[PDB]
Amino acid sequence: TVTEPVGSYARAERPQDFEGFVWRLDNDGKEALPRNFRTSADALRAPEKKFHLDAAYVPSREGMDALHISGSSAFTPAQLKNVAAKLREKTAGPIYDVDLRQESHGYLDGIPVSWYGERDWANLGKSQHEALADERHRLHAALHKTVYIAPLGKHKLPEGGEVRRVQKVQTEQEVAEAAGMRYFRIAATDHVWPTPENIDRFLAFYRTLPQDAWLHFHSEAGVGRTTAFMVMTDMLKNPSVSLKDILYRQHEIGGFYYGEFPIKTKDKDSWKTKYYREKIVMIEQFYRYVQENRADGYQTPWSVWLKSHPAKAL
């Protein structure tokens, strides 16, 4: 009897130990665009040394022109508008803001903030219903109230920032719509592989999208969670493309590399190590799901299939 199967390790952590304690500044708004902005129309560039990949390797671009996806970090409303404008030049289809953040976040006086708990796990273990409920309550509770908004220091603790009496509160959905983008939330926990719940939701959503739909994925940094879903979308829309080509091309356009590599972390970040290994295994497990379920149109949901074909630990 296994308590937590591969892909659900995070379920063993205690939520009560990472509760939110401060409104974190998600972006200073000094740049015109969010950080790590990238699209599937972008040219591939040299891989990052840390991933020890083959720089001479030329990944196939098959299906990238019609992939129509992009990724980025969190953003201010103005930055989102700039993103929408840039994407509108590439498509005449609906542009979706796919919010992959489980952590409660929103905008106070137009400032992008999030209720930060240690490890960014303020909503760990909560269902999407509970997470959004927490988010809605906190945002509203901030109106006409004094709050402290601050960026984090090297040890993930408040550093400087500012104090203000909020006069306007907005959800990301509001910001997205005001930017001319449709909105879709997937409460994925930061630093770990998306839950079976997260993926089932995405998969159902993905199946009903128009042919010309453009997906702009984003999380906090625009790296871990953002790349995982960009990778999954790439595999789903281009099942004939090898796992290697998918992983390489998603990384070389500016994303994270989800294949094996010499994982290295500072002592204070040693806790992230097993979660990185788990994601590597689950990336391969999803690829297997796509290859073995595409033929019948994915009649079997990911969560169901996963239980029938559990991934092997690392």
Binding annotation for 1D-myo-inositol hexakisphosphate: 24, 156, 191, 220-225, 272, 276, 279
Residue 64 per-residue DSSP state: S
Kindly give, in sequence order, each residue whose CB lies less than 8 Å from that of residue 15, ignoring residues fewer than 6 positions away: 121, 123, 124, 125, 126
By CB under 5 A, residue 197 contacts Cl ion: yes
> Residue 128 CB, nearest distance to Cl ion (Å)?
4
Least separation in angstroms between CB 197 and Cl ion: 4
Least distance (Å) between residue 64 CB and Cl ion: 32
Sheet containing 105-108: which strands, arranged edge to edge?
162-165, 146-150, 20-25, 111-117, 105-108, 169-170
Minimum CB separation from Cl ion for residue 173, in Å? 18
Q: Which three-class secondary structure string do you get for 7-21?
A: CCHHHHCCHHHCCEE
Please choose, out of 86-94, 122-130, 167-175, 299-307, the segment that lies near Cl ion by the rule CB under 5 A: 122-130
Question: How many residues sit in the footprint of Cl ion (CB under 5 A)?
Answer: 3
Q: Which of 271, 274, 255 is nearest to 72 (CA)?
A: 255
Using CB under 5 A as the binding rule, whether residue 204 contacts Cl ion is answered as no
265 sits near Cl ion (criterion: CB under 5 A): no
Q: What's the rounded Cα separation, in Å, for the pair 134 and 83?
A: 28
Q: What is the DSSP letter of 112?
A: E
Pattern of binders to Cl ion over 138-177, x per CB under 5 A? Answer: ----------------------------------------
Copy the structure tokens of residue 9: 């390790």
Of 28, 45, 52, 127, the residue at the interface with Cl ion (CB under 5 A) is 127
* E strands in the chain: 20-25, 38-39, 69-72, 95-101, 105-108, 111-117, 146-150, 162-165, 169-170, 182-188, 214-218
Give the one residue of 60, 128, 293, 303 binding Cl ion; rule: CB under 5 A.
128
Binding string, residues 72-111; x marks residues near Cl ion by CB under 5 A: ----------------------------------------
Residue stretches of the annotated binding site: 24, 156, 191, 220-225, 272, 276, 279
Token representation of residue 219: 């999380």
CB of 198 to Cl ion, least distance (A): 8
Question: Which residues lie across from 149 on neighbouring strands?
Answer: 23, 162
Query: Which residue, 127 or 291, is less far from Cl ion as judged by CB?
Result: 127
Q: At its nearest, how many Å lie between Cl ion and the CB of residue 138?
A: 19
Which residue ranges make up the site for Cl ion (CB under 5 A)? Answer: 127-128, 197
